[PDB]
Every structure is written in structure tokens, then in C-alpha cells.
Ligand SMILES: Nc1nc2c(ncn2[C@@H]2O[C@H](COP(=O)(O)OP(=O)(O)NP(=O)(O)O)[C@@H](O)[C@H]2O)c(=O)[nH]1
Ligand SMILES: Nc1nc2c(ncn2[C@@H]2O[C@H](COP(=O)(O)OP(=O)(O)NP(=O)(O)O)[C@@H](O)[C@H]2O)c(=O)[nH]1
């Protein structure tokens with residue numbers, strides 16, 4: 001048997017709209033990540049999707065077919081049990097250009113990524129470029145490029161695109177990144193991809209001793225109709241632990257918290273609660289470490305967690321000292337061009353009074369630029385952000401021709 005453990009690594013799945021990210025996650029894990037009505041009706045990813053799988057290897061078999069996602073080797077001709085390697089998880093991002101901020105939110109949770117490039121579309125499409133640049137900015141450098149949809153192009157065309165992909169990464173941080181051709185739809189060459197994930201997206205070192213911090217990307221009311229009273233539960237908060245660890249019965253707080261009035265002014269009240277349970281996927285645990293998307297059960301009224309109400313928050317231990325800032329100072333750099341537009345325009349300098357979008361951790365917030373200098377801006381936010389360490393990465397977006405466009409990045413200075 002294989003053990004039941006939490007996932008130990010998060011692999012992002014990024015790329016231009018409809019290039020096959022969600023189908024690829026399904027090919028690997030058997031799970032369709034889209035859970036929302038609107039996603040099903042439109043046939044697109046809107047919210048971050050999530051799926052897990054065990055990975056193992058049949059030691060008697062040849063690679064790549066030796067790599068399996070279930071405890072059997074019968075497919076590669078062996079009656080032996082495969083050796084368990086690890087449990088992995090996927091953060092499935094939307095490709096739509098209007099949803100870049102959601103991709104950025106998910107990128108804060110990634111330990112590595114797969115950039116899916118469709119073989120039957122011109123290269124490089126706008127969000128192929130934009131997601132690639134975002135990975136580079138955020139530092140998600142453990143990348144595999146997957147050439148998807150090879151089932152609907154000639155061998156010659158796939159080879160031509162392969163060479164353009166290699167030329168694209170030439171002279172960049174991604175120069176040595178592998179390209180693995182697959183058909184997500186027909187589940188072709190997925191075993192090579194699993195092998196590639198093992199080789200190129202190793203589980204990173206974790207720091208379990210720093211103060212526990214979880215970035216929140218989901219929150220839920222888990223109470224379903226037809227449930228008996230003693231099975232009702234408090235609100236559940238989902239996210240990824242980026243450092244430290246959490247345990248059942250720990251006193252925690254959600255930051256910034258709830259928007260309230262205090263002394264005639266808007267304020268955020270930290271939400272104090274206790275961990276009632278911990279789950280990854282369909283499995284309960286007594287503690288949670290980095291890796292995977294954890295569901296933290298609390299004693300909160302479910303009306304407070306319902307419908308991703310807490311998306312963008314962080315969770316820490318109750319006694320942790322964490323800056324919650326309405327005004328932030330950013331040491332910034334700008335990209336030279338707007339990479340996500342169909343025509344890559346030059347990026348204009350930041351000016352005072354601009355409204356910018358700031359991605360910090362899993363949060364997305366609009367703010368007004370109150371000061372501009374050569375390398376520093378100050379921004380007054382519409383909602384405060386929890387800043388759990390010095391020099392946290394932020395990504396800066398500007399509204400250009402009706403779309404929010406990534407234009408730069410920086411470090412939040414505290
Ligand atoms: N021929 C072919 N079609 C594929 C392949 N993979 C996905 N598709 C098709 O491409 C379409 C989009 O797939 P989907 O997985 O939803 O793409 P996505 O990149 O997740 N889209 P989004 O950016 O909105 O999340 C679907 O019709 C799907 O069946 C493939 O390998 N071959
Ligand atoms: N900590 C904790 N997490 C829970 C509990 N029940 C469900 N969850 C988690 O909360 C999230 C939402 O689960 P749920 O509302 O049941 O929806 P679902 O089962 O994922 N999908 P669907 O409702 O379509 O079947 C999941 O991550 C699930 O694992 C619980 O008692 N404790």
C-alpha cells in the first residue's frame with residue numbers, strides 16, 4: 001500500500017487561454033478542476049483550480065512508463081507494487097487575459113510550474129508571454145514547458161514550434177527548461193511528463209521553524225443540505241502554508257480580518273479563531289505543512305467564510321506580530337513593454353495619482369500612487385495588506401485600454 005500523506009509540492013499550470021491547462025491536470029490526476037457554475041457554462045477556468053495525485057515508480061519497468069499515479073504496475077507488465085515517491089498537487093490557473101490577477105495570486109503558491117503551449121496556435125500568444133514573464137518575476141524558475149495538442153498538427157509543425165520555443169527561452173533564465181510534447185485530450189506521453197516533473201520540479205526545502213503563515217485563496221461554508229445537526233461545522237479556510245506549520249487546536253488569526261467601523265473610520269478587525277480540523281483533498285490530518293492546498297476548519301460562523309469571502313487574507317498564529325498596512329512603500333522596477341497585450345506597447349513611467357493594482361501574496365488590491373521617485377513609490381490602498389516578512393514581492397498592474405496589465409514588480413519595504 002501507499003501511505004496517505006499531504007501533497008509536498010505545488011505545481012502551477014499556466015499558459016494562454018484554451019491551450020489545455022485544465023485538460024492536462026485531468027490527464028495527470030483524473031480530476032476536472034472547474035467547480036463553479038460559470039466555469040462550466042463558459043468552458044473556461046475562472047477561479048484557481050486544484051487537484052492532487054500520488055506519484056510512484058515501477059522499479060522493474062522501463063521509463064517513462066514506469067511512472068504511475070496509482071499503486072499498480074500492471075500497465076508496464078509487472079505484478080510488483082510501485083515505489084511511492086511523493087504526493088503532488090496542481091494550481092490550475094486561468095489563461096484568460098482578464099484574469100491575469102488570478103494567475104498572479106496562484107503564482108504566490110507555486111513551487112514550480114508547467115507552461116502549456118498549444119501546438120496548433122501561433123507562438124508566442126499574449127498570455128504565453130505574460131505568464132512566462134510573471135513566473136520569472138515571481139521566481140518560479142522550476143519550469144517545464146509542455147507542448148500540448150500535438151494530436152492535431154503534423155510532426156513537422158510540432159518540430160518547427162519546438163525550435164521556436166527553444167529560441168524563445170534562449171538567453172533567458174529558462175534557457176535549459178525542457179519541452180515535453182503531449183496530448184492532454186488523448187492522454188499521450190503523460191508518463192514522460194510525470195518523469196519530467198520528478199526530475200525538474202523537485203520538492204523544495206521548507207522552513208518549519210519560522211512563524212506559520214498561510215496564504216488564503218479559498219473560503220467555504222461546507223454545510224450541505226440534508227446534513228444532520230451534529231455533522232454541521234464552522235467555516236473552512238483554504239490556502240497554502242508558505243512557512244512553518246499548523247496544528248489542530250492552535251489559536252490562529254485571519255489578517256487583515258473583517259471590514260468594520262471604529263471611531264468613525266474604516267478599520268480591519270483581526271479574526272481570531274481556533275483550528276478545528278485540517279484536510280487536504282478528502283483526507284484528514286492533525287497537522288499541515290507547506291505543500292498542497294490545505295482546508296483549515298475553524299469555529300467561525302460559516303457566513304464569514306462563505307463564497308471565498310476571505311480570499312487574499314493570510315492566517316498566522318494568534319500571537320504573531322504581522323504588519324497590516326493601508327499605505328505601502330515599494331522599491332520597484334518596470335517592464336519595458338506590456339507583454340500581455342496583442343501588440344506589445346511600451347510601458348509609461350508611473351505617475352502620482354495613478355490607480356494601480358498590487359498583487360501581494362494571494363491578495364489583489366487597488367491603490368492610488370501618492371509618491372513617485374526613481375526606484376520607489378508609495379501607494380494608498382483601498383484595503384490594507386498583511387505583510388508577513390520584509391522584502392515580499394509585489395507585482396504591479398496598470399489599466400491599459402480597459403484591461404489590467406502587468407507592468408512591473410517590486411519589494412514591499414517595511
Ligand atoms: N485536440 C486537442 N484538444 C485539446 C487538448 N487539450 C485540450 N484540448 C481542448 O482545448 C479546449 C480547452 O481546454 P482547457 O483544458 O479547458 O484549456 P485551458 O487552458 O484550461 N483554458 P482556460 O485558459 O480558460 O483555463 C477544450 O476543448 C479541450 O478539449 C489536446 O491535447 N488536443
Ligand atoms: N478542515 C476541513 N475541511 C473540510 C471539511 N469538510 C470539507 N472540507 C474541505 O472544504 C473544501 C470544500 O468541500 P465541499 O464543500 O465538501 O465541496 P467539495 O466536496 O469539494 N465539492 P462538491 O461539494 O462539489 O462535492 C474541500 O477542500 C474539503 O476538503 C471539514 O470537516 N474540515
Ligand SMILES: [Mg+2]
Nearest residue numbers: 021022044045
Ligand atoms: Mg483551464
